Amino acid sequence: HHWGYGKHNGPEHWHKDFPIAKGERQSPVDIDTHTAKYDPSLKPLSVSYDQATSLRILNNGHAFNVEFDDSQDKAVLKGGPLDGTYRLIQFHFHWGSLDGQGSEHTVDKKKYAAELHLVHWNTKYGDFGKAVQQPDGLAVLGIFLKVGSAKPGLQKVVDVLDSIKTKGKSADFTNFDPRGLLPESLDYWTYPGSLTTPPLLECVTWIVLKEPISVSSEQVLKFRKLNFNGEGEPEELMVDNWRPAQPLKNRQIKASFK
């Protein structure tokens, strides 16, 4: 009886195994755009993905991850609110059963159809496992998805999902360029938070882009064909794998833009 997204193991239950669920810097949050303060000291975000080396795509039973070789100084996030250099390790999405929900962060209570998380670890801690034990260990770049025109740079991901329908399936997924998932603008909000799935560790500087990307209805429909269950188990579609907004408590959300 491990954690998931259902009535009996979903977000409202996670605090029993992971008491930090009720902590002081949990994610996601609602971004109140009128209360977020423009901070002219914030730097432009530096996203340098020219040398990113995707390796593999994995259905891990809660989402799918596109994994990167993070053994060298490649694919890194700097600037913005960050001190020093953060290296890309994986990306994944959260999405809904319907186009009207799926994002983890919300904007003035608006839910997007999905949310992309590009996960990076602070190179001062040497690798990901040590970084998650630190309050400035990770930087997650969050990007909203709305349904409209297709995102051509997403299609390679969509097309491999049939090969990882079920929990534990992976496929080689080399040469995927995450630059194709980025909107035009790097305007962002930022706040201190947590992992949005167990273990819910309070180690993340969240950077949420204002501009969503558009994906087609057909692209997101293919996300919704994935399964939470393993092969030869009763089918439970992988949908609504999002945690709701958590209390802001004593935090300030800062905007990079006026």
List interacting residues with ligand 9E2 (CB under 6 A): 117, 119, 128-129, 132, 140, 195-197, 199
Least distance to ligand 9E2, CB of residue 60, Å = 9
Is residue 49 within 8 A of residue 178, CB to CB? The reply is yes
Is residue 25 within 8 A of residue 194, CB to CB? The reply is yes
34 is an annotated ligand-binding site residue = no
- List phi, psi (to 5°) of 130: -75, -35
Cα 169–chain centre separation: 20
Tokens of 160: 């491999």
Q: Which of the residues 15, 62, 105, 120 is marked catalytic?
A: 62
Instruction: Pick one of 78, 105, 111, 117: the residue that binds Zn ion (CB under 5 A).
Output: 117
Least distance to ligand 9E2, CB of residue 130, Å = 8
- Side-chain-side CA neighbours of residue 198 (13 Å): 16
197 is an annotated ligand-binding site residue = yes
Contacted by 199, from Zn ion, ligand 9E2, none: CB < 5 to 8 Å by type: ligand 9E2
Question: Does 25 interact with Zn ion (rule: CB under 5 A)?
Answer: no
Least distance to Zn ion, CB of residue 79, Å = 22
Least distance to Zn ion, CB of residue 94, Å = 6
Least distance to ligand 9E2, CB of residue 46, Å = 20
Cα 196–chain centre separation: 8
Locus of tokens 């969503």 = 212
Q: Say how far apart CA 138 and CA 134 lie, in whole Å.
A: 8
1 is an annotated ligand-binding site residue = no
Residue 154, SS3 per DSSP: helix
Using the minimum distance from each CB to ligand 9E2, give the nearer residue, 141 or 215: 141
Using the minimum distance from each CB to Zn ion, give the nearer residue, 194 or 234: 194
130: how many CB neighbours lie within 10 A of its CB?
13
Comparing every residue's Cβ against Zn ion, the nearest one is 117
DSSP β-ladder status, 188-193 and 204-209: antiparallel
Is residue 88 within 8 A of residue 118, CB to CB? The reply is yes
Q: Percent helix, strand, coil in the chain (nearest 5)?
A: 15, 30, 55
Using the minimum distance from each CB to ligand 9E2, give the nearer residue, 125 or 128: 128
Locus of tokens 């399964």 = 227
95: how many CB neighbours lie within 10 A of its CB?
26
Catalytic residue check, 2: no
Using the minimum distance from each CB to ligand 9E2, give the nearer residue, 18 or 110: 18
Using the minimum distance from each CB to Zn ion, give the nearer residue, 117 or 167: 117
Contacted by 26, from ligand 9E2, Zn ion, none: CB < 5 to 8 Å by type: none
13 is an annotated ligand-binding site residue = no
Locus of tokens 């560790």 = 201
Contacted by 128, from Zn ion, ligand 9E2, none: CB < 5 to 8 Å by type: ligand 9E2
Residues near Zn ion (CB under 5 A): 117
Positions at the binding site for Zn(2+): 92, 94, 117
- Active-site residues, by number, are 62
